[PDB]
């Protein structure tokens, strides 16, 4: 949306001068957003996973992909094929539409918001963030929902380092400390 | 809870507190005034109050100003 051309018109020029880039497109860019939540206790009951899937489809207008256990582990008593959690990945336009409304309404609605930590990068330039609450998004009316299941936001950028990854997210007015 | 006026402390504690602040931190004061309220000038001291058998060292911090000296000295043992 507006964030996309804002990136084209401002962020590219902001980062080109800062890091002394020689080519136009060597500046990093975000390529996808991955949303999930592993309900886990859906081992006992099935209707929780269908409820979580309805939440993710409300937060982002896509049907979540149900994910199943990769290997049987006796610690939590699960086996291969058991659906454990959902997953949604956003690319292109729908990525920006969710991204713009994450940084502008959802995060400011966090109860006792103090600031998102800037040391959450995975060592290559990608950002991961928990939310602990699915009510901060306006698409939840607090009455349909029953549980307090949290999401897991992942920012997959093409940055070669977290030093560049921090700068790219900062140029989008990301609430770091 | 005391009354409308006059946070009540004994002279001998108040007199001893005055000489305690003139030399910074010092040795703990061996006092018996459990009823004496903690004045703000007692912050940072290491007053020792009687619990019946043993003077216990209580280190007065900024948050203990409305309480009394014997309030931080348990006087009966359990388990």
């Amino acid at each position: 949306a507006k964030l996309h051309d804002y990136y084209k018109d401002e962020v590219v020029k902001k980062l080109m001068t800062e890091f002394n880039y020689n080519s136009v497109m060597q500046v990093p860019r975000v390529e996808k957003i991955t949303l999930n939540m592993g309900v886990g206790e859906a081992i006992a009951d099935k209707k929780l996973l269908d409820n979580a899937a309805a939440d993710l489809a409300a937060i982002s207008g896509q049907k979540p992909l149900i994910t199943k256990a990769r290997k049987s582990v006796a610690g939590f008593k699960i086996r291969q094929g058991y659906p454990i959690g959902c997953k949604v990945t956003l690319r292109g336009e729908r990525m920006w539409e969710f991204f713009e409304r994450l940084i502008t309404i959802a995060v400011p609605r966090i109860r006792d918001f103090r600031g998102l930590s800037a040391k959450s990068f995975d060592g290559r330039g990608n950002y991961s963030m928990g939310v602990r609450e699915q009510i901060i998004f306006p698409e939840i009316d607090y009455d349909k929902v029953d549980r307090v299941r949290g999401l897991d936001i992942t920012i997959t950028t093409t940055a070669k380092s977290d030093e560049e990854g921090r700068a790219l997210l900062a140029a989008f007015d990301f609430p770091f400390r | 809870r005391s009354l409308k006026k006059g946070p009540f402390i004994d002279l001998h504690l108040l007199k001893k507190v005055e000489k305690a602040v003139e030399s910074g931190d010092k040795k703990p004061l061996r006092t018996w005034s459990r009823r004496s309220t903690i004045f703000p000038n007692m912050i940072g001291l290491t007053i020792a109050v009687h619990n019946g058998r043993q003077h216990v060292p209580v280190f007065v911090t900024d948050e203990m100003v409305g309480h009394k000296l014997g309030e931080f000295a348990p006087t009966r043992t359990y388990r």
């Binding site: - | 948050e63 203990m64 309480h67 309030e71 931080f72 348990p74």
Partner: protein, 114 residues
């Protein structure tokens, strides 16, 4: 009908529905209607949605269920960490106002465990 948390109870007089807010009792309830121009006898489902707006802001001047739980929590938590005598009685789960524990005080001790 709808205040800070929820004014769910309908069919009830005004001075009773506002009692459902954690932080509003009875005299604090009557303070709202005295300055809101609404009589005590008035029903919640009968008053207009415009007067709900005036009810909302008067309640907001007090401290209610949201921030009052935090406000109370620090009051208890301060004593516990400070190591006061009342802090000890909060940790041990015994009455703090200096009363009997020989046979009574089942409210703080709880169910009888022999």
């Amino acid at each position: 009908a709808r205040i800070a948390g929820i004014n769910i109870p309908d069919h009830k007089h005004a001075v009773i529905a506002l009692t459902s807010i954690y932080g509003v009792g009875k005299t604090r309830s009557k303070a709202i209607l005295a300055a809101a121009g609404i009589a005590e006898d008035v029903k919640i489902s009968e008053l207009s949605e415009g007067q709900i707006d005036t009810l909302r802001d008067e309640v907001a001047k007090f401290v209610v269920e949201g921030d009052l739980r935090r406000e109370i929590s620090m009051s208890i938590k301060r004593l516990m960490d400070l190591g006061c005598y009342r802090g000890l009685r909060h940790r041990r789960g015994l009455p703090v106002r200096g009363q009997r524990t020989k046979t009574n005080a089942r409210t703080r001790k709880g169910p009888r465990k022999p």
